């Protein structure tokens, strides 16, 4: 056929939402079984929405309604469409409408980074906005390279970048980002390798922070002796 | 309207679900039951094969009073299959089944604790190491909790590879933190009695087990050897189903229930009691 | 638990003489030989049946070097092991599905390799310190 | 399971252990007590300090038991039947402690026999110690 229009429903904008494919004259969703960032990457390039920020499968975008076209897909990342992987059969599935898979793309994402509860505007507890919610970052795997990327992304003197929130208390909400692995050259914090958004093995005590400075305001002395 | 229920369940009725008087049966108001052994993400204990995907929903973690983790197998939405030696842990040989039930703690799924209404042992549990566990209420079947189906055939034919999940001890003799499984092939029966007893003839049988204790070997049990990587089942794996995947209809069948888990890696074969032998007894027990 | 300064000093002193290019490969080969189910994850490393094939495998030696480098990285950050091993634990749990007990088995095999290499210098105190180290590494690399 | 080659390697390794078996077992017990203090709960009547005469005697007994097991590698359950009953019922030693002691014995053999602790011999000795532990932990309940 080669005329399968694909849309994203109930996700705020066009590039984010629940995947939905029209085949045989009817609109159908996709199961989240064996759904990873590779499948999310394919969907994002289908709509020309850029790279894949993350994927969702717990029907957070909303309950679906229709014939679930795809159940299990084997996508390595480089596909011309979602209907090119080993979809194990068309229409056949073992899901319900609660297992439908969504995707958030770069073009439609409102990703942002901010610093809150710090001594200055360049330091504090690092917070990121996924799906328009402000969440924190776990400090596991958070190193100076991630601090350098965060300092450059936010924008202020980044000559000296230090991890660890300054006097900042535990964050509240979600821990969107964990085990960030930046090499120091990424434009922002979400282009680095990390865990799936929202999935983590941390608590809000381990909330990651950053200390951006030009080196003029770092003083160290010995007291009491 | 038509009566239909959610996933992992099949309608249990006579004629469709269109109704409130039904033109087929009247006012039956059917209730739909669970699904035989169709895991959401099927698979494909000293050894590895970490059950990362939750490929064995039927496996249940049974802990005794003195904290010896053992295994159980969901056979239907409310009952489970285990071994009589597992239920008699921390109990006298004369202890009945009435006081065993409050002792046990059962976990299905991730850690979903389920209350045990009653426990019934096999009448000949000295020869057929089987005990049945009944829950207080039917468990909620999902991608992590789902009964295995009792086979209609005998899949214990030599050479058949079944997957043995387990919550028992590992290569460090530590009770495994995560559920594991192995792909043990059923071995020749004569080689198994010959391995444990003397010569498969009653007048020449001797306690020849490479491990201290002797398994219960009879016509109701088969044996599965170690896998290709010399991995087997260890203490606490008893009661776990010898799950066999029938490729024809894509259904998982409890071909056997692991009875002799003391074959960690020394004895070459683990002894599994045939479910088909006990299938008639368990079905009669489900009725009452 | 926090590691005492004497135990830390003993661990560091014993690790200073550890051949990074060979000890890790020896430990990985011993793990694949003693526990053959660990060869399941290295089916792409070539022949692994004979123990001599396992120990002489160049890919096994390279991966043992990488594993021992990861051990050194966790040693330099003994007080922060979960943070340093988050990415490796995620890799092993999701991409590789390595059972956590394999990490404890490899830690024990590495302790055996260290004892084999250092003779009587691997005293029961430094062995206790290294057991604490490998237990921390395995726990940080698990779940 | 112990292959004939594994049995040969175990017999050779324990033969070259020889008369040093008593102090090998004492060192293994000390290593188990230090590395894994949870195994000390099974010895509340022992003096568990370094160089203890009581720990040395118990290590000698353990090594004599291992020598008997090596000599009866084809009939280990019968050789260790008394010890199996003892550990499983009277002392109720949990099998994880048996694996810890096996690991400590392997560490002692590696530290004292580095030339003869080849990966094949190491695997064979690990298999033999696993067999000993399984025989001793079989009757545990
Ligand atoms: C116990 C401590 C261990 C440490 C510190 C460790 C460390 C590492 C490191 C540094 C890598 C490379 C990561 C990469 O290339 O991206 C890796 C990958 C890997 N590990 Fe481990 N490892 C350990 C245990 C194990 C065990 C016990 C097994 C198997 C039984 C195992 C199996 C693997 C495999 C299969 C890979 C990927 C091989 C490849 O990329 O070609 N690891 N590990
Ligand atoms: C390869 C493993 C082991 C061997 C060969 C072994 C062997 C022995 C032997 C020969 C005895 C002397 C019993 C007698 O003379 O009546 C003994 C006693 C004992 N064993 Fe073990 N054993 C092993 C493992 C363990 C472990 C791991 C523990 C504890 C963590 C343990 C705890 C004890 C205790 C408490 C006694 C009583 C000693 C006394 O009361 O003085 N055994 N064992
Ligand atoms: C961390 O320190 C900064 C700087 O002292 C704190 O920010 C000040 O907070 C007080 C209230 O306690 C305000 O009156 C000031 O106007 C703040 N100054 C700036 C520059 O923000 C911050 O509250 C501290 N964070 C904590 C204690 O969690
Ligand atoms: C069930 O387990 C408990 C705890 O392991 C056993 O209670 C112990 O029994 C031994 C031997 O009689 C005593 O030395 C301990 O002091 C008891 N511990 C307690 C009561 O906390 C109990 O005997 C076991 N039941 C059996 C074996 O039937
Ligand atoms: C079993 O473990 C529980 C905690 O999980 C503990 O409260 C109980 O005392 C233990 N029982 C025995 C007999 O050790
Ligand atoms: C127990 O054994 C007797 C005879 O050995 C047999 O008739 C009976 O059916 C057995 N019990 C069950 C539940 O099958
Ligand atoms: Ca799903
Ligand atoms: Ca599916
Ligand atoms: Ca942390």
UniProtKB/Swiss-Prot annotation, chain A:
What is recorded about the protein's domains? The SRCR domain 3 mediates calcium-sensitive interaction with hemoglobin/haptoglobin complexes.
| Purpose | Acute phase-regulated receptor involved in clearance and endocytosis of hemoglobin/haptoglobin complexes by macrophages and may thereby protect tissues from free hemoglobin-mediated oxidative damage. May play a role in the uptake and recycling of iron, via endocytosis of hemoglobin/haptoglobin and subsequent breakdown of heme. Binds hemoglobin/haptoglobin complexes in a calcium-dependent and pH-dependent manner. Exhibits a higher affinity for complexes of hemoglobin and multimeric haptoglobin of HP*1F phenotype than for complexes of hemoglobin and dimeric haptoglobin of HP*1S phenotype.
Question: Where is this protein localized, as stated in its record?
Answer: Cell membrane
Q: Where is the SRCR domain?
A: 6-106, 113-213
Q: What triggers production of this protein?
A: Induced by anti-inflammatory mediators such as glucocorticoids, interleukin-6/IL6 and interleukin-10/IL10; suppressed by pro-inflammatory mediators like bacterial lipopolysaccharides (LPS), IFNG/IFN-gamma and TNF.
Please state what the protein is called.
Answer: Scavenger receptor cysteine-rich type 1 protein M130
Q: What else is known?
A: Intravenous lipopolysaccharide (LPS) produces a rapid rise of sCD163 in plasma of patient as it induces metalloproteinase-mediated shedding from monocytes surface. Long-term LPS infusion finally increases expression of the membrane-bound form on circulating monocytes.
Curated annotation (Swiss-Prot), chain B:
- The region called Interaction with CD163 is annotated at 201-206
Q: Which residues are glycosylated?
A: 67, 90, 94, 124
Domain Peptidase S1: where? 45-287
Q: Which domain of life is it from?
A: Eukaryota
Disulfide connectivity?
Answer: 5-32, 36-149, 192-223, 234-264
Q: What is this protein called?
A: Haptoglobin beta chain
Q: Which organism is it from?
A: Homo sapiens (Human)
Query: What is this protein's gene name?
Result: HP
Included stretch of the parent chain:
107 to 405 of 406
UniProtKB/Swiss-Prot annotation, chain C:
Q: What is the effect of changing residue 11 to D?
A: In Windsor; O(2) affinity up; unstable
Q: Which gene encodes it?
A: HBB
Explain what the record says happens when changing residue 51 to R.
In Willamette; O(2) affinity up; unstable
Q: What is the effect of changing residue 10 to V?
A: In Iraq-Halabja
Q: What is the effect of changing residue 130 to D?
A: In Wien; unstable
Keyword Membrane assigned to the entry: answer is no
Q: Which GO terms describe its biological process?
A: blood vessel diameter maintenance; carbon dioxide transport; cellular oxidant detoxification; hydrogen peroxide catabolic process; inflammatory response; nitric oxide transport; oxygen transport; platelet aggregation
Q: What would changing residue 45 to S do, according to UniProt?
A: In Cheverly; unstable
Q: What does the UniProt record report as the effect of altering residue 98 to G in this chain?
A: In Nottingham; unstable
**Positions bearing carbohydrate:** 1, 8, 17, 66, 120
Please describe the organ and tissue distribution of this protein's expression: Red blood cells.
* Entry protein name: Hemoglobin subunit beta
Query: What's the effect of swapping residue 35 to F?
Result: In Philly; O(2) affinity up; unstable
Tell me what happens on changing residue 75 to P. Answer: In Atlanta; unstable
Q: What is the effect of changing residue 97 to L?
A: In Wood; O(2) affinity up
Q: How changing residue 93 to R affects the protein?
A: In Okazaki; O(2) affinity up; unstable
Q: Changing residue 101 to K does what?
A: In British Columbia; O(2) affinity up
What would changing residue 68 to H do, according to UniProt? Answer: In Brisbane; O(2) affinity up
Swiss-Prot record, chain D:
Residues binding heme b are 87
Effect caused by changing residue 84 to R: In Etobicoke; O(2) affinity up
Phenotype when changing residue 130 to P? In Sun Prairie; unstable
Q: What is the effect of changing residue 92 to Q?
A: In J-Cape Town; O(2) affinity up
Gene3D superfamilies documented for this protein: Globins
Entry-linked Pfam families: Globin
Domain of life of the source = Eukaryota
The listed outcome for residue 109 to R is: In Suan-Dok; unstable; causes alpha-thalassemia
**Annotated consequence of substituting residue 141 to C:** In Nunobiki; O(2) affinity up
Describe tissue expression: Red blood cells.
Name the CDD domains for this protein.
Hb-alpha-like (cd08927)
As for what it does, the entry says: Involved in oxygen transport from the lung to the various peripheral tissues.
The entry sums up its family as follows: Belongs to the globin family.
Q: Which disease is it linked to?
A: Heinz body anemias: Form of non-spherocytic hemolytic anemia of Dacie type 1. After splenectomy, which has little benefit, basophilic inclusions called Heinz bodies are demonstrable in the erythrocytes. Before splenectomy, diffuse or punctate basophilia may be evident. Most of these cases are probably instances of hemoglobinopathy. The hemoglobin demonstrates heat lability. Heinz bodies are observed also with the Ivemark syndrome (asplenia with cardiovascular anomalies) and with glutathione peroxidase deficiency.
Name assigned to this protein: Hemoglobin subunit alpha
């Amino acid at each position: 056929g080669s005329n399968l229009e694909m849309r994203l429903t109930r996700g705020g904008n066009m590039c984010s939402g629940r995947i939905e494919i029209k085949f045989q004259g009817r609109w159908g969703t996709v199961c989240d079984d064996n759904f990873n960032i590779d499948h999310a990457s394919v969907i994002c390039r289908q709509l020309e929405c850029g790279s894949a920020v993350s994927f969702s499968g717990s029907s957070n975008f909303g309950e679906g309604s229709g014939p679930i076209w795809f159940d299990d897909l084997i996508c390595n990342g480089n596909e011309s469409a979602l209907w090119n992987c080993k979809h194990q059969g068309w229409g056949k599935h073992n899901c319900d409408h609660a297992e439908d898979a969504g995707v958030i793309c770069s073009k439609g994402a409102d990703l942002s980074l901010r610093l809150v509860d710090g001594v200055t505007e360049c330091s504090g507890r690092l917070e990121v906005r996924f799906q328009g919610e402000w969440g924190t970052i776990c400090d596991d795997g958070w190193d100076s390279y991630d601090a350098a990327v965060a300092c450059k992304q936010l924008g202020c003197p980044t000559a000296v970048t230090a991890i660890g929130r300054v006097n900042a208390s535990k964050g509240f909400g979600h821990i969107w980002l964990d085990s960030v692995s930046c090499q120091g050259h990424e434009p922002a914090i979400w282009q680095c390798k990390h865990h799936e958004w929202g999935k983590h093995y941390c608590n809000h005590n381990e909330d990651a922070g950053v200390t951006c400075s030009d080196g003029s305001d770092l003083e160290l002395r010995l007291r009491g002796g | 309207v038509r009566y239909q229920c959610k996933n992992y369940y099949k309608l249990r009725t006579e004629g469709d679900g269109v109704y409130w008087i039904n033109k087929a049966v009247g006012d039956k108001l059917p209730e739909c039951e669970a699904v035989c052994g169709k895991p959401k993400n099927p698979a494909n204990i000293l050894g590895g094969h970490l059950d990362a995907k939750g490929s064995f929903p039927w496996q249940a973690k049974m802990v005794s009073h003195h904290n010896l983790t053992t295994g159980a197998t969901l056979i239907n939405e409310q009952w489970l299959l285990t071994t009589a030696k597992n239920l008699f842990l921390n109990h006298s040989e004369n202890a009945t089944a009435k006081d065993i039930a409050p002792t046990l703690t059962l976990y299905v799924g991730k850690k979903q604790l389920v209350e045990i209404e009653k426990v019934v042992l096999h009448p000949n549990y000295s020869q057929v190491d089987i005990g049945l566990i009944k829950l207080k209420q039917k468990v909620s079947v999902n991608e992590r909790v789902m009964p295995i189906c009792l086979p209609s055939k005998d899949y214990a034919e030599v050479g058949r590879v079944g997957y043995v999940s387990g919550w028992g001890r590992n290569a460090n003799f530590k009770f495994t933190d995560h559920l594991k499984y192995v792909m043990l092939p059923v071995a020749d029966q004569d080689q198994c009695i010959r391995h444990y007893e003397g010569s498969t003839v009653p007048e020449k049988k001797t306690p020849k087990s490479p491990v201290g204790v002797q398994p219960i070997l009879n016509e109701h049990t088969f044996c599965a050897g170690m896998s290709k990587y010399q991995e087997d089942t260890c203490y606490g794996d008893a009661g776990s189903a010898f799950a066999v995947h029938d490729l024809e209809e894509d259904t998982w069948y409890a071909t056997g229930i692991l009875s002799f888990d003391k074959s960690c890696a020394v004895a070459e074969y683990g002894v599994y009691v045939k479910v088909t032998s006990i299938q008639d007894w368990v079905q009669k027990t489900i009725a009452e | 638990v926090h590691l005492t300064p004497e135990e830390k000093s003993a661990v560091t002193a014993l690790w200073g003489k550890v051949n990074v290019d060979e000890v890790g490969g020896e430990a990985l080969g011993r793990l694949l030989v003693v526990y053959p189910w660990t060869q399941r994850f290295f089916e792409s490393f070539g022949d692994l049946s004979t123990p001599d094939a396992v120990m002489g495998n160049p890919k096994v030696k390279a991966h043992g070097k990488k594993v021992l480098g990861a051990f050194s990285d966790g040693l330099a950050h003994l007080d922060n092991l979960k943070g340093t091993f988050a990415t490796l634990s995620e890799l092993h749990c999701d991409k590789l599905h390595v059972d956590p007990e394999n990490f404890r088995l490899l830690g024990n095999v590495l302790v055996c390799v260290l004892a084999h290499h250092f003779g009587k210098e691997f005293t029961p105190p430094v062995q206790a310190a290294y057991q604490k180290v490998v237990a921390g590494v395995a726990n940080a690399l698990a779940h | 399971v112990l292959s004939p080659a594994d049995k040969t390697n175990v017999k050779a390794a324990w033969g070259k252990v020889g008369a040093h078996a008593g102090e090998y077992g004492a060192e293994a017990l000390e290593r188990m007590f230090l590395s894994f203090p949870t195994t000390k709960t099974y010895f509340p009547h022992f003096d568990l300090s370094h160089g203890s005469a009581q720990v040395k005697g118990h290590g000698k007994k353990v090594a004599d038991a291992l020598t008997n097991a090596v000599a009866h590698v084809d009939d280990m359950p019968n050789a260790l039947s008394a010890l199996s009953d003892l550990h499983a019922h009277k002392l109720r030693v949990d099998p994880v402690n048996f694996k810890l002691l096996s690991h400590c014995l392997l560490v002692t053999l590696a530290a004292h026999l580095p030339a003869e602790f080849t990966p094949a011999v190491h695997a064979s000795l690990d298999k033999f110690l696993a067999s000993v532990s399984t025989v001793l932990t079989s009757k545990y309940r």
